[model samples]
Target: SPCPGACVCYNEPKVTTSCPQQGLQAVPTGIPASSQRIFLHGNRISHVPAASFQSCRNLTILWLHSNALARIDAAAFTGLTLLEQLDLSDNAQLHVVDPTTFHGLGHLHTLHLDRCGLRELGPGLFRGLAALQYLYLQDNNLQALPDNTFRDLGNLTHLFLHGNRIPSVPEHAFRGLHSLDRLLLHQNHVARVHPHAFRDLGRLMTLYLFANNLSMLPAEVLMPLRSLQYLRLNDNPWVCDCRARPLWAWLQKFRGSSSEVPCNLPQRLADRDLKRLAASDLEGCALPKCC
Candidate 1:
């Protein structure tokens, strides 16, 4: 079918377009007013016309990933009130997202910005996205996130921060989220997880810290997240000694079933199966006995 502005439009189970590798510099001019999804990947398009999507009120998904997009003009998606998913990942030249870029997308549920070359999350980055549920920031070069980068996302459930350069998080990093469940921090440079990094997440369940540089699990680190059930701490090199004494005791004293117990320190001890190691056999630390 043909779009309103004479742009080509195709439809199948869902609307799919291949404006790929086109050396076009501006957004295709004649897209149908009813386009629900558009793909402009592998193009040299550096800027989109302000009115490019004026008629695309029902657009739910848009993919501008893998292009040479450098700067997204403010109010770029002002009319996408019904948009639910947007993918801007893999745009190496893309740099920033103006604060009001997504002002009216209150119904947006998923956003993908992986490998977008984002340097930092500006203030008010998530200003009005009250209904946002999932966000992907993996494979970016994010060194640190702003204090309230995710504060306004009261309904966010799953957040991915894998493969970044974040070594430490602000104490009150996740403050405003009341419905967050899973926070993936795998494959980062995190050496210390601040004691209050999870100050207000009353519903966080699984926290993945695998493949980091943490040397030990600070006792105070888990104090804030009262509902954390599963913690993945595998593959970090933690020093083993009497300092590890408390961790060894806590693991045994936890009365939950064997499946819920956390890992013990001293990777060597884990090799020998700390669960089976009698309390009296632990040499360096005076391991406590479970009830």
Candidate 2:
């Protein structure tokens, strides 16, 4: 049954549920202590009370995916040490997630923050998340990331940052992520990427950059990625000209080999195979030459 404050809490046989949508300006109490999963979608929740989840000692998966959450209180999740998975997606106005928002949540493994309008992340935001593995920060307003953002995430394996305003990745952003395998950075405003951004990413296998604005990739950027298997660069406005001569040569050398680098620049070259075209033939000056 739903509570009086517009939050819904249902007790079905052996399970307890709490999903309040209409009357919640903050996290509501009155949830049964035996709750295993809770959903608080489509509400006007501005703050999460510290004791709201104190009784839920058995809670494992919590879904707060969609709401009017512009700001979350630092003490919102004070006692939820047993919580494992949390989904906080589709909250368009949620611009800030304080560095201490998830301080004491030691058991948390999967965290989702997609489409939260987060433009910037403070340092040490995830300093104590030793158990965290999967994180989703796609579809936000992030333009750039600080270098040490993921330095301490030793256990992290998968990360999603496909959709955002990320025009560039600072050097040494992925320094300590030794176990990371999949990294998604496609569909952003990335026109320029630091050549040394992926220098220490020793275990990274696949990198997706399908929909971007990259006209040319510096040769130094590709040399360090020794273990890179799949590289996607399609659907971007690639400015091909004599200035990109080195990029054309680099792609051709690794076209059929392990790199398998594909050309996704310029609409006309979309159909033609990048391996077939010679470097000089793809060197037509599309824009004015600059000294």
Candidate 3:
């Protein structure tokens, strides 16, 4: 077959192919279809036209990271039904992708769209990836996520969405991730997390909410996570007043590991750890008598 001059065709390990750091301008042609794994990273491909990889019926893993990709047609992967992993990360210029771009990738188990300068993700995106287990959308320019944005990713376990500018979480934001175990949302600008924001993450074990701008979180928000073991809530401006009652109460029974939660209010309790404070420390407050 006519392979690119700078590409490599491996015979062992079941005939794999790669063209990483080849300085290629676009996808090459005539590579053997028997290659199950394909690598196209570190190239200068700026745009993926329609049906870019339409001929590779046996392709299971595709790597297209670290390229100058700025545009991708909806049919860029028309015949890639058997693909399990697709990495399009590090394409800083590619700001948006069509919702139906992954329509036929049902068997895909891992997808990477991180560091692509994406500022938003519509609700319909990722609806077809029912088998996906690991998803990466970190280091982007995103500000907010629509409700139920990940409702279809029930099988997802490891999700990385940190390093953005999200200000707050909405109810039902993570509604259908039943199998999630580790969720990384640190290093954002979150001011408040909706009470029901994590209603669907029952199986989650590790959660990172540190290094944010949180003042207080309702205890009900962490109630649904029955399997939670490791939680990080340090480095925030915590107001350990009547508003901090629920979380403080919940932490008393939590046998898992939690970081130090310092008090930033009530000069008498300043710098004190909320987890170890006596109940009388927060007594005689208004109790937020709103209905």
Q: Quick one: best lDDT, which candidate?
A: 3
For residues 1-291, write the lDDT of model 1, one tens digit per residue: 565342346777566544766666767866776778887777777775454676788788888877777888777887889899988888766767777777778999999888887777888887889989999888888888668888879999999998888887777677788898989888888877766778777688878887778655545566556677766666665544454445556555544322322234555555343434566544564222321
Once fitted onto the true fold, the runs of candidate 1 whose alpha carbons sit more than 4 angstroms away are: 4-23, 49-51, 224-229, 245-291
TM-score of each: 0.80, 0.81, 0.94
Error of 2 at 2 (Å): 12
Which lDDT tens digits does candidate 3 get at residues 1-291?
Answer: 556677888867756788999888888776677778889999999988887777778889899999999988988989999999999999998988888788888899999999999878865788878999999999998899779888889899999989988888899788899999999888889999998899889999999998889988999999999999999988788888778888899999999999888887777788788999987786654224321
For TM-score, candidate 2 versus 3, the one ahead is: 3
Model 2 ranges with Cα > 4 A deviation = 1-15, 20-23, 241-246, 249-275, 282-291
List, residue by residue over 72-124, the lDDT tens digit for candidate 2: 77777777888888887888888988888878877889999999999787887
| Candidate 1 collision pairs | 5-30, 7-30, 21-42
Q: Which regions of candidate 3 fall more than 4 Å away from where they truly are? A: 284-291
Error of 3 at 129 (Å): 0.8
Tell me the RMSD of model 3 versus the true structure.
1.9
As for TM-score, the candidate ahead, 1 or 2, is: 2
Per-candidate count of clashing residue pairs (backbone under 3 Å): 3, 3, 0
- The candidate maximizing TM-score is 3
